[PDB]
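Q: For a teaching handout, I want to show students what a protein-ligand complex looks like in token form. Below are the inputs, and the small molecule is manganese (II) ion. Please produce the holo structure.
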Amino acid sequence: RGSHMEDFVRQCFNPMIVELAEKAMKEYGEDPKIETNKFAAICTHLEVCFMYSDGGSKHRFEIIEGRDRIMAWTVVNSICNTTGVEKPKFLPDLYDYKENRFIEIGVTRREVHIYYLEKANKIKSEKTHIHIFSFTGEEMATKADYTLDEESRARIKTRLFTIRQEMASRSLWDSFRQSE
Amino acid sequence: RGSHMEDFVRQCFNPMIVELAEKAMKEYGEDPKIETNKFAAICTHLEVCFMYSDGGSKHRFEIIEGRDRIMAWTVVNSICNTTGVEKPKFLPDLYDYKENRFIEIGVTRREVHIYYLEKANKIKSEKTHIHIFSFTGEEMATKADYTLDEESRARIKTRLFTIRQEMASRSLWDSFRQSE
Amino acid sequence: RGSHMEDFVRQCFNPMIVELAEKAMKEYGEDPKIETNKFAAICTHLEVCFMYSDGGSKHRFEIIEGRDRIMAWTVVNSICNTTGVEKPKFLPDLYDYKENRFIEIGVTRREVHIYYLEKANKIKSEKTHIHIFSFTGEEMATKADYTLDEESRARIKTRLFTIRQEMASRSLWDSFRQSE
Amino acid sequence: RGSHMEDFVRQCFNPMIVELAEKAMKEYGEDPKIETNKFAAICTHLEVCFMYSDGGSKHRFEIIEGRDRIMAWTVVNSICNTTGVEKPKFLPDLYDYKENRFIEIGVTRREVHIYYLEKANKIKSEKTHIHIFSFTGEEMATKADYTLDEESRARIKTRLFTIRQEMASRSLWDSFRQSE
Amino acid sequence: RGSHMEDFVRQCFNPMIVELAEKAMKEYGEDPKIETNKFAAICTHLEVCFMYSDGGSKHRFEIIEGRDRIMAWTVVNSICNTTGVEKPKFLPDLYDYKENRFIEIGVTRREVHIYYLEKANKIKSEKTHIHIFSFTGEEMATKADYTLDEESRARIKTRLFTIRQEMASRSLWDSFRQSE
Amino acid sequence: RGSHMEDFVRQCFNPMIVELAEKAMKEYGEDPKIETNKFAAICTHLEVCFMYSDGGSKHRFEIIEGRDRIMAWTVVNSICNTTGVEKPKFLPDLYDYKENRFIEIGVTRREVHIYYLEKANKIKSEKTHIHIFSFTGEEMATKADYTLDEESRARIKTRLFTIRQEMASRSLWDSFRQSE
Amino acid sequence: RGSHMEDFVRQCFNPMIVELAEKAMKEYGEDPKIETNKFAAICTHLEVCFMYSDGGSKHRFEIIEGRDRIMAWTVVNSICNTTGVEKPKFLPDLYDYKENRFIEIGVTRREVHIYYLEKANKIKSEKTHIHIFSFTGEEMATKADYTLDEESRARIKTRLFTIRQEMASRSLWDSFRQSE
Amino acid sequence: RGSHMEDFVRQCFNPMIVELAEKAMKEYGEDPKIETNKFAAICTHLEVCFMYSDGGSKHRFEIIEGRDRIMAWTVVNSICNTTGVEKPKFLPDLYDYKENRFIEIGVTRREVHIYYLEKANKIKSEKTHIHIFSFTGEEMATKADYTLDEESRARIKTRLFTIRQEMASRSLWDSFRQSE
Ligand SMILES: COc1cc(CCNC(=O)c2nc(-c3ccccc3C)[nH]c(=O)c2O)ccc1O
Ligand SMILES: COc1cc(CCNC(=O)c2nc(-c3ccccc3C)[nH]c(=O)c2O)ccc1O
Ligand SMILES: COc1cc(CCNC(=O)c2nc(-c3ccccc3C)[nH]c(=O)c2O)ccc1O
Ligand SMILES: COc1cc(CCNC(=O)c2nc(-c3ccccc3C)[nH]c(=O)c2O)ccc1O
Ligand SMILES: COc1cc(CCNC(=O)c2nc(-c3ccccc3C)[nH]c(=O)c2O)ccc1O
Ligand SMILES: COc1cc(CCNC(=O)c2nc(-c3ccccc3C)[nH]c(=O)c2O)ccc1O
Ligand SMILES: COc1cc(CCNC(=O)c2nc(-c3ccccc3C)[nH]c(=O)c2O)ccc1O
Ligand SMILES: [Mn+2]
Ligand SMILES: [Mn+2]
Ligand SMILES: [Mn+2]
Ligand SMILES: [Mn+2]
Ligand SMILES: [Mn+2]
Ligand SMILES: [Mn+2]
Ligand SMILES: [Mn+2]
Ligand SMILES: [Mn+2]
Ligand SMILES: [Mn+2]
Ligand SMILES: [Mn+2]
Ligand SMILES: [Mn+2]
Ligand SMILES: [Mn+2]
Ligand SMILES: [Mn+2]
Ligand SMILES: [Mn+2]
Ligand SMILES: [Mn+2]
Ligand SMILES: [Mn+2]
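A: Here is the structure, written as tokens, with manganese (II) ion included.
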């Protein structure tokens, strides 16, 4: 195939992140060698999810994203059958042991307002918290509750804009934006 | 022997946990290859004990469980001869340097109410704190003092229900429950 | 799913071997959680291939098995376009830099005579060397040329019979044999 | 070349620090083998920058110094395009996610009063925070805001005076002072 | 020589601790193979010093003990020439960046009251803080200021009584006590 | 218990060797804390077995000693069912893939002539090769076939005499000799 | 800059190789970010040099390439002043302790005949051995003496053709060939 | 002290070598901080001894140099009491299990002829093999038997001349030569 995007994704993200995004796509019948613009998105979404859980206390979050589909639903059941939160219809990204809610992390190339509206329409669970990030530096969260401290969220926005700059420096950003 | 339980225990728990539970059973004349349902219990009890001490401050707990019988009693003596707490009749699991008391950790497959009553009858030391966990997500502690924060205890309950789900997914949970 | 085979495969083989066999099946639309008898075969075939290359000199073999389908064909092309050997129709397992030939490694649960005959009918390349191993301790190679020393091949047969014993000790061998 | 300074710098500083200072000089057309007094300064400035970021919270600082010139400006842009701080004219050393400002770290062999005055004249950005350290144990910061706790800044002053003592013990301090 | 004490010291303490105590004795013309009772004391004193600095914040303490005689005095000078504290007459064990004072750590086999009185008579520096521990579980500190939290000091007392029990279990404690 | 032997064994042998000898004794109902003279023998026998297999080629030997009783018999069966050698009545120490025979390694504190005669009377398998070492530097092997090169066997004799010297230097050798 | 070549070079070669080629170019006033086609050549030449020394015995070769210019000439002097070989006019790549000669390794994108002729004209040292490799699988060496075994040289040719295939798969080979 | 030699020795030799030479001098009442020219010699002698044993087979040599005085004599006794070689009067450097003799390694700054004559006069053991190296590239061995292959000895001579060049590049060689 030989995509400049694919080689950039392998140089941009940590090797363990690339491996999980590969397993995530293959589990859903997708090839990172051809769906390279996607490939960059699951890597980006995975890193943001891991930096998100890195914020806060040690035992605060339970990481759902990055596990296999069967195991992620197993941990979701264990969380629901121990706390009492209703089972979400779709797989969330994290669970906040401090606020007692599931968190859906979103990373958008378009306006934060549109994605969240698209995400909120999907999740009929209602109780699931939504937190959206953009590649321009904006963010949007449910009830204006941004969960983490400002410094942890600012670190995520900075990294997102760095991925955007490195992509545009290789003339790959325009195709990345016009693909979501 | 070739027990599905034994292979599940080795896949479910961290290798160091399995090694300590093996040494614990062998020290008391028990073979994990035949007493597989037990084998899963010492592993579960060991992990809960280690996640428990992982909660709280750095120097808060002294881990008694997981040591050899002679060395565990040596540390118990050192704690008693330095603080002044009475020597317990039976080996506890942890010592809380913050609350100045020994902690007995229990993990039950039956109702939390029965196990604690069974545990409290045994410990005539009285001063020893009891903290029970169940595979269904409930917990019971002495004087309603649960020692740790809610997030640390919720992480233990979630892991316990995951072990239950993985066991039932292999048709091994029913024999595990009807063996305590 | 919860298969005793799946847990045995994870306990029997080295973790890196299990990961490569997982990626190998998923690349060809197969799930190790349901195709557990297969899952044990790619792991077994992978280990035999790696012990095979472990025999002989340092730079003797080029390992084709265990790579992704695209990369394995890239190395096959490089070997053909540098030595002059004809491109095989199917992906082989190794290349012998000493004998200047590709090697197809086979591991059979049935009689070695049948598998090799089945393998030789497939490879019209003719030049590709075939080396078959069985779980009973027999082996068969092209032109009676067994490539490696007797000690290296004996180590492979011993390991194969150990996998057979561990499988039969868990009542999983009968289903493994009646599935090839 | 064979400079006593060069061998002292390699023995005094951590190997990773020496490698970054080497790459920093070579990127700007300087050879650490001849510009040995300089070589000791970029190493010293690099370590102080890393101990500075080591103070405070986990996600507090973004380390600009120690990166390549192109990548450091990329992170500066990402910070400016996400928070809104004006782009500084010169490359700073850190960014404080807590106070929302860039920090310029200075290490002087002369009086702290002169260096800061020289530094403040250069940075027309105004918003950039300046923090100066000396090899005698004094420090000077903008608006008397020293950012970190006293213990973290005291650790930096102690290390600086140790470098001075080790240098003077080798008769290399006098040439180091008369070279800034 | 073949001393039971020497083999116990190597089994009781961490290997890095044993190496530093060896270098400490040899620097002062002492052989751990014959002065085995001493050998156990520098190891004990070294571990207590390291557990002491392990208490408190990250940048709180500067470890003087465990360095070579020349380097320890270099760091003492740097601390004195940066904070302003008077140079102590004898080498202390730690410096408290929080309380701005040097700390002398003592471990006694006799009554805590006698050792501290012996230590206080030696240090004419006056400003140096003294903190004594005993193998029986008692402690004594200057101005009743024990610097660390109760849990960190209780961990040190517990370890000291464990060393006493292991020594007495080998009939080596009586000679250890009658040698200070 | 507090045995000088036990502390010497932990200081003399590599930690992994001590762990295997511990598991070996406990599997056969023996406590290394009281049976200390024995404890030194399984450690010595284990190291000699590992240095023995270290001699020769890479795939030459299959290590039977050091495995659990069930797994060692599994590998013995695999070797017998693949080569054709008769199943030995007692567990041997190694299998020689080069000479096609099992090897029984013996380490004696008495005369090599007596032990081998005692060993040969036990093994009715006849085909099993016997190789005896002594703590004085002598050795005896079946059919005068010493399997390995002279340098590898000389390294084993040297190590054995070093263990003897270290034991006698602690007045533990006399009890060690009068206990076989 | 954002070159597809630069990202491919970082994905194709081992990270340590990329670091040495970076230091090699910067030492000679070249930037791998703009001279990307070159950047791929020093990486390729470096790997071939390291695989070359990997062939043969343990102490056979002394690696000159990959060191700094000053240190490489130091080792060249030591080799000349100990064996007696004349000092070469230009820095070679290796020294063969077996054949007692320096080796110049060449990797060409054009015909092997032209490069060697260009190389031989440069080296007036005459005694220096020349060994050329091409990306098509051919090789040329002085006096038809190819130094290493066929398997080691075949491994180098295979890797070279793999780099060519990966480059052409990204449409970067044509610019790579038309740049030597 | 601050010696350019001391800093060069720490930069020139591997850290483990420097630590052993430090322990070797301190065991004999010598300080590497003042006896810096010596300090460079024990490091040089230690490395040559380790490269010497690195030549030849795996179990060929027993390394005597680099151990403590008591332990080195213990291994010497074990070698003498197992092979039968007479106990040497002075501590040798290695034992050759292949040739059955002790080896004394010498490194001279003067003529090889003088040192060996000085060494041979000392060793009345006669059976001990002597092998001398010089910093100019010459060597001298007993009975013209140089033990190792030419390539292994040539690697030692090359390293010795590199140490000489690095020393002379720092104006430290002249004092090093005029101190033996
Ligand atoms: C759809 O196929 C895949 C499925 C998974 C696992 C489940 N998906 C998520 O969890 C998830 N996916 C996305 C996402 C990413 C790229 C394109 C489209 C979307 C919608 N954005 C999230 O925020 C999120 O949480 C992983 C990779 C895939 O390619
Ligand atoms: C009984 O034999 C063993 C003894 C030990 C060490 C001492 N036991 C405990 O500390 C302990 N045991 C249990 C426990 C676990 C399984 C079945 C029955 C019980 C009662 N539950 C605890 O809560 C606890 O603290 C370890 C493993 C054994 O199999
Ligand atoms: C078929 O789907 C898969 C394909 C691959 C990669 C290509 N296959 C081989 O290379 C290969 N496969 C087998 C094999 C293994 C199990 C069942 C059936 C067979 C026929 N036996 C070989 O000897 C061999 O060389 C890996 C795992 C798969 O499940
Ligand atoms: C000038 O050439 C180099 C440039 C860099 C990168 C950019 N420079 C800094 O960031 C920087 N330099 C200095 C500095 C250090 C030594 C002498 C003179 C000065 C002025 N003091 C800082 O405080 C600082 O922030 C690194 C090493 C160089 O040699
Ligand atoms: C005296 O010779 C040695 C000197 C040092 C370094 C300086 N000494 C201390 O720092 C120090 N020594 C002791 C100490 C320990 C054992 C016996 C007697 C005493 C008095 N108790 C401390 O509290 C302390 O701080 C180390 C080991 C020695 O053997
Ligand atoms: C007997 O109980 C134990 C059993 C094992 C495993 C099986 N035993 C051997 O394999 C084995 N034992 C011995 C041996 C060692 C000490 C005392 C007596 C003897 C006779 N000498 C061998 O040469 C040998 O091969 C390990 C440790 C034990 O304590
Ligand atoms: C003399 O004091 C020390 C003793 C030792 C251990 C025993 N010495 C040797 O083994 C040894 N010494 C030397 C040597 C080295 C420097 C100056 C003088 C000499 C004569 N040359 C050898 O060849 C050798 O074998 C180590 C370091 C010392 O400083
Ligand atoms: Mn998700
Ligand atoms: Mn999401
Ligand atoms: Mn317990
Ligand atoms: Mn319990
Ligand atoms: Mn295949
Ligand atoms: Mn195959
Ligand atoms: Mn800067
Ligand atoms: Mn600065
Ligand atoms: Mn002290
Ligand atoms: Mn003290
Ligand atoms: Mn045995
Ligand atoms: Mn035996
Ligand atoms: Mn070159
Ligand atoms: Mn070249
Ligand atoms: Mn010597
Ligand atoms: Mn010598």
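A: Two things your students might notice: The pocket of manganese (II) ion (ligand 14) is lined by residues D 65, 91, 93 (CB under 6 Å). The radius of gyration of chain H is 16 Å.
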